[PDB]
Design a protein around this ligand. Structure first.
Ligand SMILES: Cc1cc2nc3c(=O)[nH]c(=O)nc-3n(C[C@H](O)[C@H](O)[C@H](O)COP(=O)(O)OP(=O)(O)OC[C@H]3O[C@@H](n4cnc5c(N)ncnc54)[C@H](O)[C@@H]3O)c2cc1C
Ligand SMILES: Cc1cc2nc3c(=O)[nH]c(=O)nc-3n(C[C@H](O)[C@H](O)[C@H](O)COP(=O)(O)OP(=O)(O)OC[C@H]3O[C@@H](n4cnc5c(N)ncnc54)[C@H](O)[C@@H]3O)c2cc1C
Ligand SMILES: Cc1cc2nc3c(=O)[nH]c(=O)nc-3n(C[C@H](O)[C@H](O)[C@H](O)COP(=O)(O)OP(=O)(O)OC[C@H]3O[C@@H](n4cnc5c(N)ncnc54)[C@H](O)[C@@H]3O)c2cc1C
Ligand SMILES: Cc1cc2nc3c(=O)[nH]c(=O)nc-3n(C[C@H](O)[C@H](O)[C@H](O)COP(=O)(O)OP(=O)(O)OC[C@H]3O[C@@H](n4cnc5c(N)ncnc54)[C@H](O)[C@@H]3O)c2cc1C
Lengths: 364, 364, 364, 364
């Protein structure tokens, strides 16, 4: 552990890992501190949908940022594999957003004018996916709302960062950021470090740092429970999505299934009632899943903010300190654009003012 | 591996392990052959209830054998620990057989005249176990229908048998039993061995040997799926039982919960619909289970016979061959009595004639 | 389960799975029977090297068959993914066969005349792989001796076969093949089935079937123990190979490490002494591995034959019966060529006579 | 969660769980806060030896406290089971401290004058334990240095505390302790709570709180790596111990084997070189272990202090604050005595002054 770094990142989920990579790529001398292991919390619980078209209700700067991040994934697998040897496991089948009523149909068809979406009738859906529930009314097909394996996107980013000279410290929680002197310094149980810039990317745990730095921004966990099964018997290429729940086919032959929403629960392991509810929902979407062998079950904590949008930007009173936290159901999707925007700010490059405004820290 | 043994046991579940122990205690030179690892199939799936009082319909020979076997468990843990160093994990809390209707109350109170049983009102049940469902009408308390951990009963028996001289061959499937000569022989992939007596204790897989030896006795698997949770928050001492389903409190703090009944299914891991149904049923018996963290899921194959009773006895044309298989939901309970009976028969000792008839091979 | 099939395959490792696929692709009505789960035995233990240049000592028909099978892998990932949705996880880094003495150098340089191999000096090796042991003398670089994840090659083959109409029966061991009538029929615990052709692909367990069919061909297990670690800190692209031991970098960031050779041991789980020896060897090849976190440990049984070559062909007295078993350290490599050769025979196509001879059943 | 508690415990390992129990038994309104799950860190890594006689150098106050704590285990299993339903799994076989040189024999025989100990010759050791290494010179037999399973001691204490009224908050890290007011308060991400007394029992992570409260007491992790195997073949009743390494027979049939010593390492999973060294050492103590099937690998962080002794006592400037942390290799042994001492201090009862001095916070 060196005494001085140009940039220090606090937290090693997908968000901090991406930021470290983009900083290292700009030749900033960078360190990352993670309390546990890289990718070991909410990042490991995520399905991995690049779900930009759960964001086009409202068609605003948040949708625009989401589509930009989706485009950034285009060459990303190759770029990171060349440096890390780690495959992000991209699956380009796309998504059927299912309807189970005429009310569902009217809501989904509001997206018809987007070039990125096409409406499929009940019969057109079943020709492509014969095992989708016969109670559907049709589905919006979203070709580019693909998926990746999030733990491996995170490991790819961090290994690439390391090969570009970033210094990674697992099992090293950050206790304090100060703030006082002409440089920031951070305190850890194994010594102290100075930095020209500090980035807080500690997910749902980020509130301690806002408060330490004179800011009241808070986070509420919304727990989500999931399971996986082996699909050894039927074809399924597209992701199936309904009412924030999903069945995602991975290239291992597993299906990933979720999820509950349990506000205010900080526990990271699933309950019996939660898993029961996940099973019940999945069966309404793909009836044949009742016969599939169960693999695993898990949970994670979504980092909920007051208004439901992330904080991505500078401390309003100190440009040396930055935050990137509060990606509720979209942190995998938004990892590259988040990483790029934070790196650009630290480098004093011009950035998109609509995104700078939308994600700013002081939203009064 | 020797050329000849006085007795050979085929199968290393709880039934075969018990038989080898009783035989070695009689100073029979004994070997046991098991296809995989000891206790690795149906024995590992069982809850471990000593459920004699799910067996008192017609209060007959089968009920008498069950009560005898239950009594044989009295000093067993201490006996086997002295030779093996393995604890069978006996829990003497007893069982509440619950009622959820006036029909249930009638059926259950027919046991009131037995010394083994006492009726509890709704209010008396909730005094002892406040978290039992408030929809009950009361319960029968059976003090002696206690529980053990069946994998460790199996390991205790086999290690005890080893210390007394038995030779145990894991990863050694038996392919054939030959009758034609003065003594028997068996064939394995590691070589062929002679034996004075052979005992078939291969569970639901026993059909192959019956057929090989001129008998049409057949087995149907009835698969059962179970789950466990951690009970970190409430007191629960007694087992809860209703309509062949159960919640069994272990001394680790886990609850064992089951079970489905799927006839004709030879698969040994649980599917999604089965686990969903187990969770649904458990919640009606103990509502607070909804909030408990899930630990593990599993399944096993009950060995079903034409009339639901096991075959424990000699081949009717050859007293050198014996069978001990088809213990449907009662093989943990019946392991000691089954072992003692087969060993007594090999020794040509007098045995109970009602039991010998009830479990005979030739039932037409 | 139907009464009649055109072709029946006994065993569901990678070999039987491939054969079922090629038969289904020829529109033969096919069934496969597997005792347990698909790919669940020796196939799951394998590293997955396509190791043809461990076969060019002797430069004979076996080397030629191995190179042919390696070429068959070229478009295989894509062909199977299109039908199954399962990714075989191919890694095209290639292999350094290391030397640690001048005697090693002379032996490896015997391959220099092959276009598929280039000799690298000590310094040339370390420029590509700086963490390979500094005690090496150089290495042969074998560009096309790449690797795949064998469990997933097997799952891809079987899911593709199913989509082409093959019928797959897990948890259905075959008890007997007969032989007697104008058609073969096979016996299982859940009923009997007739077939115009039967293929034995039961790996190290295949001996029972040879013997049932009047043939004395035998198999000896050679157990191999392995482990995996997480490589989160150093670059490693090429497989490292020395004296039948190896370090294989997977695209998850894990390294796969092996292996012991324990003749006559049928146990399928690793010993303490075996794993210790694997650790010791790995450290001599890649010293930095001592600091890497351990992931998993496992074992499997290599199917050893008398002369060390597989049996791939017809029963000499009955062209309806075929065998494909005894691939010692090369069954992953040889899976496509094995599958193709068996399918071609069943279809009465002309085949390569050198390969037909080399792998024939009656090698006197 | 209430606004105020009479006592608050920070940390839910074995030390904190014990403290909460003794406090609730005194009818103190008590809460305990734990960052993750109860017993989930160093407590889960421990073998569970009650090793008082690895503590008799200078036969001093520390040895006396160890013997007192060992005596407190006498009725503990039964006491905690009555309230919790959780078995601590005590094994009363005792310990052989082995000698492999004349130097070892001299050191060990200095304990001969204690009532707790008896010397055994080589021949007398091998009579009792035939599989101990034949290279030994004899061993000291310590009957009372028995073992328990530490995770279940922890779970028993906490569940017992709950039944007596303690309120337990998992997934609730404490960020700060404030001294300035009439009562203390603590800050958590779920809100801030007042308390009359606060006890810091956060193991190797306790340094943060010392520093927060004006004290420079520091902690260094000494990581230890262990493994387990299945002992299915030999008798082993006594624990074997040599040079801080051990083989501990559990009543499940497992052996627990350890351990390395890696100062300065905060990582909590084992590396390859560490496990290799544990296997090598175990084979010198019990050669037959080479053939045993491996079960599990793990690691944990010993909380090392400047002089190797724990801090158990009051903050020297504020009697409302207490610490109980830095139990290096003896925290399972010392849990009962540590709990009773902290509880007695909170109650203002008279305590042993030698012990109060030996473990005081201000050692300069
Ligand atoms: C059920 C579920 C499914 C989801 N599915 C999707 C999906 O399909 N698509 C999508 O885009 N999003 C999805 N999400 C959302 C996504 O998981 C999150 O937005 C994302 O993982 C947040 O990333 P992060 O790096 O901020 O947080 P985390 O992964 O939680 O990482 C934060 C890290 O900070 C560390 N930390 C905390 N405190 C400190 C400290 N003091 N010092 C050092 N380190 C510290 C932690 O140990 C942790 O590793 C899903 C979420 C859930 C729970
Ligand atoms: C969900 C579930 C819950 C249950 N709960 C209870 C309960 O609470 N109480 C109770 O009393 N009972 C219970 N049972 C029933 C109990 O599990 C069985 O009756 C009992 O395990 C049967 O033991 P076994 O030794 O006959 O069979 P198994 O344990 O299946 O052993 C047979 C052995 O034979 C071996 N074998 C097969 N073929 C060969 C061969 N060719 N050569 C060598 N070896 C071979 C197998 O590998 C296997 O290990 C339960 C069952 C299920 C499924
Ligand atoms: C440590 C290790 C590493 C290896 N690494 C490599 C490598 O890198 N490259 C390579 O090419 N090879 C490697 N091998 C060799 C390779 O694993 C084998 O050659 C290959 O898996 C054999 O395939 P199989 O289908 O014949 O056997 P298996 O995978 O063992 O399949 C046979 C199947 O038959 C079933 N069966 C048995 N009896 C019956 C019955 N009565 N009825 C129905 N089914 C039955 C079994 O359940 C089993 O699933 C390695 C082997 C080991 C052990
Ligand atoms: C390999 C190994 C073998 C050992 N074998 C033995 C043995 O045989 N016998 C013996 O007596 N001892 C043994 N020990 C030592 C023993 O494990 C320890 O002395 C003991 O576990 C310490 O318990 P603890 O409660 O202090 O620490 P821990 O169990 O580490 O508990 C501390 C708790 O504090 C929590 N925490 C930290 N920060 C906060 C916060 N801010 N807010 C809330 N909670 C927080 C943590 O999450 C943790 O659960 C062994 C140790 C090792 C590593």
């Amino acid at each position: 552990m060196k005494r001085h770094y140009e940039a220090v990142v606090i937290g090693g989920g997908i968000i901090g890992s991406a930021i470290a990579y983009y900083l290292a790529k700009e030749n900033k001398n960078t360190a990352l501190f993670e309390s546990g292991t890289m990718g070991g919390r909410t990042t490991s619980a995520a399905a991995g949908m690049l779900g930009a078209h759960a964001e086009c209700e409202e068609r605003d700067a948040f949708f625009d940022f989401a589509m930009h991040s989706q485009r950034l994934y285009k060459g990303l697998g190759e770029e990171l594999y060349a440096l890390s040897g780690v495959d992000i496991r991209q699956h380009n089948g796309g998504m059927f957003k299912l309807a189970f009523s005429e009310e569902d149909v009217l809501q989904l068809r509001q997206m018809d004018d987007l070039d990125s979406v096409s409406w499929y009738s009940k019969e057109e859906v079943l020709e492509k996916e014969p095992y989708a529930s016969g109670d559907i009314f049709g589905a919006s097909f979203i070709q580019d709302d693909v998926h990746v394996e999030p733990y491996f996107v995170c490991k790819a980013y961090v290994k690439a960062a390391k090969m570009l000279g970033a210094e990674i410290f697992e099992h090293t929680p950050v206790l304090h950021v100060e703030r006082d002197g002409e440089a920031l310094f951070i305190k850890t149980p194994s010594g102290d470090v100075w930095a020209n810039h500090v980035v807080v990317a500690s997910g749902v745990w980020s509130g301690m740092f806002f408060k330490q730095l004179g800011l009241n921004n808070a986070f509420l966990p919304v727990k989500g429970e999931c399971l996986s099964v082996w699909n050894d018997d039927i074809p399924l290429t597209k992701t199936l999505y309904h009412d924030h729940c999903y069945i995602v086919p991975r290239k291992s032959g597993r299906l990933v299934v979720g999820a509950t929403m349990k506000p205010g629960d900080w526990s990271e392991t699933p309950d019996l009632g939660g898993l029961e509810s996940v099973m019940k929902k999945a069966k309404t979407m793909l009836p044949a899943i009742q016969n599939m062998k169960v693999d695993r079950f898990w949970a994670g904590l979504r980092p909920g903010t007051k208004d439901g949008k992330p904080y991505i930007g500078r401390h309003p009173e100190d440009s040396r300190i930055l935050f990137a936290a509060g990606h509720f159901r979209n942190g995998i999707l938004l990892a590259p654009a988040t990483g790029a925007l934070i790196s650009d700010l630290i480098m004093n490059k011009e950035v998109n003012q609509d995104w700078l405004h939308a994600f700013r820290i002081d939203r009064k």
